[PDB]
Amino acid sequence: DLAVIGFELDTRFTNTNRRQRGHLLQTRALQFRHPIPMHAPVTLPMDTM
Amino acid sequence: DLAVIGFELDTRFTNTNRRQRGHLLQTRALQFRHPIPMHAPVTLPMDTM
């Protein structure tokens, strides 16, 4: 039964009518926030008078 | 039973009322004593003549 039965091509369109856009670029931005905590003190307990 | 049941925070106070004292720094001094002892003599005996 040896015979060619089918084929596939690498045919492509010429995108001269701009039918396809392909991938799109969009500008984006991310924002991070880092607030500063307070920390426990150190004390020098000097007596009064 | 998939659900969130609890949480914990990193919430902290601000010491604007000085409620917390933290660690205390105090001055200390130590004294060591090193008294110098006498040691046994070595003698060169001879006659008085």
Q: Which residue has 């609890």 as its token pair?
A: B6
Q: Which of A43, A36, A21, A3 is nearest to B23 (CA)?
A: A43
Q: Which of A26, A22, A3, A37 is nearest to B11 (CA)?
A: A37
Give the rounded distance of the alpha carbon of B43 from its chain centre. 48
Query: Which of A37, A38, A43 is facing B21, going by the closest CB pair?
Result: A43
Q: Which residues pair with B23 in a beta bridge?
A: A42
Q: Does A46 touch chain B (CB under 8 A)?
A: no
Cα distances from A48 to residues A23, A38, A44, in angstroms, run: 75, 28, 12
Q: What would the two tokens of residue B24 be?
A: 């205390």
Q: What would the two tokens of residue B12 be?
A: 């902290």
Query: For residue B25, which residues of chain A lie inside 8 Å, CB to CB?
Result: 42-44
**Partner-chain contact A43 B26, CB within 8 Å:** no
**Partner-chain contact B15 A37, CB within 8 Å:** no
Resolution of this structure in Å: 3.5
Q: What would the two tokens of residue B27 be?
A: 């001055």
Rounded Cα distance between B13 and A39, Å, is 9
Residue A39 backbone dihedrals phi, psi, to 5 degrees: -120, 165
How many residues make up chain B in this entry?
49
The one-letter code for the residue type at A4 is: V
Name the DSSP class of A16: G
